[model samples]
Target: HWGYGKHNGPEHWHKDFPIAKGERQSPVDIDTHTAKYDPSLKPLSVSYDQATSLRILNNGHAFNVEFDDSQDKAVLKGGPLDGTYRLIQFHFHWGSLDGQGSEHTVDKKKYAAELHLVHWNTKYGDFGKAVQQPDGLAVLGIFLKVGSAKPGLQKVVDVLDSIKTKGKSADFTNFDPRGLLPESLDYWTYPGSLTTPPLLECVTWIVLKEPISVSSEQVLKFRKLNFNGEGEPEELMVDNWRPAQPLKNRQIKASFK
Candidate 1:
């Protein structure tokens, strides 16, 4: 299995998943100097239902909160998108060290962590099939900074103890993801891929310019997570992020000037 280790990390991913070297790879460096201000970009519209949240899983890589996407209960619209995208799940990526975890960097500055709320276009039928085509996915990325603890995030953090090992899971429902987002919806948009392996190039990235705050102590709790199951020696689940990829010829459009 592919992992973020010296032997199987991002550098060696192309050996197994050739698309790891694809032109439209994700987790790119967003430089404001190279980014374009598009006045045509519309405000991002997000409608989330608390009841749509299903459960949380610790899938060896990271902790993912799954949602019920059988219908349009929770959806994202506007801001460099056409029609609507259904919310499927949300996950996080982080590093063991301070200020060095985020996948996507702004002006080459890496944050403490990054959160990805994955969504699939309704036109694609299902998330499994949608991930294979272009314009099929919309990922909203929020950078996390080390500062005061965010009470809204406490709900998710409180459950980390239960799913501390790989393949472990717990029921997580009625938690609105909207509470985790920043006040401004302004973001940078571009065509990219899933940061993880089987990295499909179908994501329309909406990376928020402003970062949300989480205390250093709270962020450290994430390190206690294990990548291995109960039978194996414990491996801290940190530095689970892919390094920034090269932006071949894609243009990053800004929603706000």
Candidate 2:
């Protein structure tokens, strides 16, 4: 019901994505003004089989990397909370044909775009089932820009042309999704809600301090995507990002040491 279609966008999402109204929503711009409250932060180590659960798919709206921890291909290694967290789905937030396209705004400064790597706690069943509960998700947010190219992101561009039509997917084998991550794992963590609606509040957010870069042409390609088909009359929903929300009293912590 909600989205960038005939009647999609943020405001209308709560009706369908009921989790939208939850205490935490993602894509919130980082508020550096807050104090670092949580200090016990560590990087998560994901297994390869777990990575294969990764699939490149285009939903009705945008391109997404769906992580299927339930796929058995996905595994995890840490302890206690450090287990295989199946990557449920990873997607990006972009601007329309004529505006800013970042969800997590830092001190109100908008970036070119923001990528979210959505993972679910394996202790629960799967992504779909786990998302319904609080503390069932972990999201890493990375910023993007149009400029000098970076090495890791080659996969994204290479695979873009093959899946031009929305909802199309193919065999995405042997590709390490982790390679796309920024060199610096340093991030800002917080208990927040999904940026989109029914904003669920069950996520431990890890936003990277550094951002990735691409070219203007590559960014333009992302902007050309839309929920419409190849022959539809609808124009592309170029920028599909939500407006930054007020931080309220929540605190966002960073892992720099």
Find the candidate with the highest lDDT and give its number. Answer: 1
Candidate 1: tens digits of C-alpha lDDT, residues 9-34: 99999988999989999999999888
Worst 10 residues of 2 by lDDT: 74-83
Whole-model lDDT, model 1 = 0.93
In model 1, pairs of residues that clash are none
RMSD of each: 0.9, 3.1
Work out the TM-score per prediction: 0.98, 0.84
Error of 1 at 89 (Å): 0.5
